[PDB]
Amino acid sequence: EVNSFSGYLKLTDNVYIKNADIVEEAKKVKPTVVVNAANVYLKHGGGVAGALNKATNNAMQVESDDYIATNGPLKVGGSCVLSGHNLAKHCLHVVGPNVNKGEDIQLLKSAYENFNQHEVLLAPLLSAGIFGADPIHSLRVCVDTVRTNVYLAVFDKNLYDKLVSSFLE
Ligand SMILES: CC(C)[C@H](Nc1ncnc2[nH]c(C3=CCOC3)cc12)c1ccc2c(c1)S(=O)(=O)CCC2
Numbered sequence: 001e002v003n004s005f006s007g008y009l010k011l012t013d014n015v016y017i018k019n020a021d022i023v024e025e026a027k028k029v030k031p032t033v034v035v036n037a038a039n040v041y042l043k044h045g046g047g048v049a050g051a052l053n054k055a056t057n058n059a060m061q062v063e064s065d066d067y068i069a070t071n072g073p074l075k076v077g078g079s080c081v082l083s084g085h086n087l088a089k090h091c092l093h094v095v096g097p098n099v100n101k102g103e104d105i106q107l108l109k110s111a112y113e114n115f116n117q118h119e120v121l122l123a124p125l126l127s128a129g130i131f132g133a134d135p136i137h138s139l140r141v142c143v144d145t146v147r148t149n150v151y152l153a154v155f156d157k158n159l160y161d162k163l164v165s166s167f168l169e
Contacts, residue, residue, distance in 0.1 A: 015143050017154060019161075027087065033122070035121055042061075052091070064082065136166045
């Protein structure tokens with residue numbers, strides 16, 4: 001069926017969260033939109049972006065290279081809509097700031113604002129992992145900024161539990 005999300009915990013009227021791999025969620029749910037945690041040149045070299053690209057058997061990377069050739073790189077805090085391939089109807093490539101590389105944490109609000117152009121999205125926790133943002137802060141920005149229906153997949157039970165505890169304080 002359409003957007004068949006299961007086993008999520010509803011945090012607010014529009015934010016849900018699950019301990020899950022976003023790739024496995026995209027394969028089972030077939031969401032209208034899957035968010036990729038992209039970089040400005042759409043080079044999906046590892047982490048979340050490498051895993052989504054691998055699940056499309058590199059079709060996502062070829063399409064991203066053609067997009068960059070015609071349009072140039074994205075800006076930090078920006079996004080573009082490309083094909084979802086076998087994972088979704090569309091992939092929304094969003095660039096959150098990479099704090100470990102000196103980018104401004106304030107741009108995380110701009111990054112989440114891109115989600116508001118889509119009614120329902122399956123997404124990762126922006127700027128977390130090796131991008132270096134505090135994951136509790138990233139969830140607070142998501143809850144305060146996103147107004148459409150967002151299903152967050154966080155592939156780590158330890159981090160999932162710390163995020164739910166922090167939200168329910
Ligand atoms: C915080 C962690 C748990 C989270 N990881 C994930 N969150 C959700 N679905 C995931 N699948 C995988 C797989 C990796 C290999 O096969 C699938 C990772 C994973 C995450 C959240 C955002 C970011 C990253 C990582 S990053 O890739 O380090 C840099 C970009 C921002």
